[PDB]
Ligand binder design. Structure first.
Ligand code: EGY
Lengths: 108, 52
């Protein structure tokens, strides 16, 4: 069961990546936005200390929220929403990705 | 230091007030309304579409 769904999903995903040269750029950005959050929590687990807690929480929020806006751009960029073009999803990505950096520079 | 009923008096001021500046108040309001409509004219007719 899971072998068939596994190899089916690997092949049907890798063909989709090799078709469009926009998708591997998104996913290459995404994976290293996961590794930033992982080692940034590893600093907390390594030495037991919790003192500048807001400065901990700001970078972690940058990693998670910045991951999510990429996944929304990917979902909206493969299949188009009814009424929204592909020139407007990108501008909304710029504006809403540009508010979040300011409110995570005030917070540290 | 001056008291109620013994220092009442008057005070006299002489001044001038031309017919030019008598009519400047409604032209001041009217110039702010006129410079307020043109912002709606420029703001309304200006291209902001991102599609073609
Ligand atoms: C929190 C709110 C702050 C927003 C500040 C910008 C205010 C823009 C106000 C737009 C007024 C509505 C008019 C409009 O529709 O323009 C939007 C406009 O689409 C956009 O949203 C793009 C605006 C951003 C431009 C990109 C530059 C980056 C801005 C600096 C951070 C584009 O959508 P449209 O092009 O109209 O969609 C297709 C055309 N139809 C006929 C189908 C409608």
């Amino acid at each position: 069961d899971f072998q068939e769904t596994f190899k089916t999903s690997k092949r049907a995903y890798f063909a989709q990546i090799e078709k469009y040269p926009k998708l591997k750029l998104i996913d290459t950005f995404c994976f290293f936005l996961v590794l930033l959050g992982v080692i940034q929590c590893t600093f907390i687990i390594l030495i037991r200390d919790n003192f500048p807690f807001n400065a901990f929480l700001a970078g972690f929020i940058i990693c998670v929220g910045q991951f999510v806006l990429l996944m929304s751009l990917r979902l909206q960029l493969c299949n188009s929403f009814p009424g929204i073009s592909k020139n407007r999803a990108f501008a909304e990505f710029i504006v809403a990705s540009l508010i979040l950096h300011f409110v995570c520079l005030h917070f540290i | 230091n001056l008291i109620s009923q013994v220092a009442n008096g008057q005070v006299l001021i002489k001044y001038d007030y031309p017919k030019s500046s008598f009519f400047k108040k409604p032209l001041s309001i009217a110039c702010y309304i006129f410079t307020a409509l043109m912002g709606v004219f420029v703001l309304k007719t200006l291209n902001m579409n991102v599609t073609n």
